[PDB]
Amino acid sequence: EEFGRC
Amino acid sequence: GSHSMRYFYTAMSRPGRGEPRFITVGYVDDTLFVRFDSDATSPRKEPRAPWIEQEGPEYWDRETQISKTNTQCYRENLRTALRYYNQSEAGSHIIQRMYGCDVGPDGRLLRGYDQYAYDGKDYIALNEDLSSWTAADTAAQITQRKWEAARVAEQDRAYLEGLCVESLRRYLENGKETLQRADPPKTHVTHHPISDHEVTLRCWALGFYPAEITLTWQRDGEDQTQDTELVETRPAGDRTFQKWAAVVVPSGEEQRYTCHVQHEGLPKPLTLRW
Amino acid sequence: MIQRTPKIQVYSRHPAENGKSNFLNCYVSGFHPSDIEVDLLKNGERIEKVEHSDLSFSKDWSFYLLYYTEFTPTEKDEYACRVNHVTLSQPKIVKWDRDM
């Protein structure tokens, strides 16, 4: 699973 | 054994050819399991390994949203990078990101990564402490200041120690038949006379997974580092990898050469000869 | 801008056996930027419907792609991978050598 923070 | 999950973003601006393409590929070890491409007709996180397909629709919606949001974010990041480097909006530029986690056999975080490149050059990387950044230049230092202000390292660390390892642990379990199976190299030596005076001994490792392998030639038990043509480990397309190492050996001297294969699928390093 | 030219390996998924269905792979790697044109050639002619892996990159940020197609190698059929990239003044053609 990704870490969406951007 | 130890495992990695890595997401790789490539955001490629292409002025005059629409908005920057955003691609994400997710790997566990050397297994691509998820992809996203903003140029896909219907951009979505897509399964690329069977064991990720059992993730529910909420997973795919959330991951796709992450990637769509990332597409916008990385287009913004490309604009930002243009500013940071005083670059025109006419050129095509690439932001890459690799992030993710290595876990040990017990599934505990071995280390986290969150590193970024601009135009193929390291830009900023989360240090192994998951708390500080290494900025490659003064532009990346601007990013670093912003991310320190935004506690990005702390957010990364929370992800890397949490969701990263947790999801990777789940993937390793769901994909245990493959992700946790090392396929040893099928190894053999081929012999290719070059001339009357020389033959190529090519030591092949085929069908191995994961990609990590050590393929060396020794002459009289001495590593032939400078005299070995070592091709990059290459995907066979069936999940496995191939590699060969070739030495040019004087005619008749084949038995002085031994190929040595280290691979996690091999209980002990193999020694092969022509 | 610092650019990196593609390494190119042309090879089969399995040891070539004439008459045996196989996969012809063209692995392009080490290149940057990511834009790359890869054709698989059968006797100099572009093989159609060649599939490629999803854009990934190595630790040095250089990209790699696997272009691949099902092929049945024969003795006489020459296969090649034709790669164009911004770093290449003209397309690089690496012939498929079943021994490599």
Numbering used by the authors:
A (entry chain P): 1 to 6
B (entry chain A): 1 to 274
C (entry chain B): 0 to 99
Publication passage describing the model:
Tapasin, a key component of the PLC, is a 48 kDa transmembrane glycoprotein that bridges the TAP transporter and MHC-I to facilitate peptide loading. Mechanistic insight has been hampered by the lack of detailed structural information concerning tapasin–MHC-I. We present here crystal structures of human tapasin complexed with the MHC-I molecule HLA-B*44:05, and with each of two anti-tapasin antibodies. Movements of the membrane proximal Ig-like domains of tapasin, HLA-B*44:05, and β2-microglobulin accompany the transition to a peptide-receptive state. Together this ensemble of crystal structures provides insights into a distinct mechanism of tapasin-mediated peptide exchange.
HLA-B*44:02 and HLA-B*44:05 (B44:02 and B44:05 hereafter), represent tapasin-dependent and tapasin-independent MHC-I molecules, respectively, based on their cell surface expression in tapasin-deficient cell lines. The F pocket is loosely conformed by inclusion of a GlyLeu dipeptide in the folding reaction. This strategy permits greater dynamics of the C-terminal portion of the peptide binding groove potentially allowing enhanced interactions with tapasin.
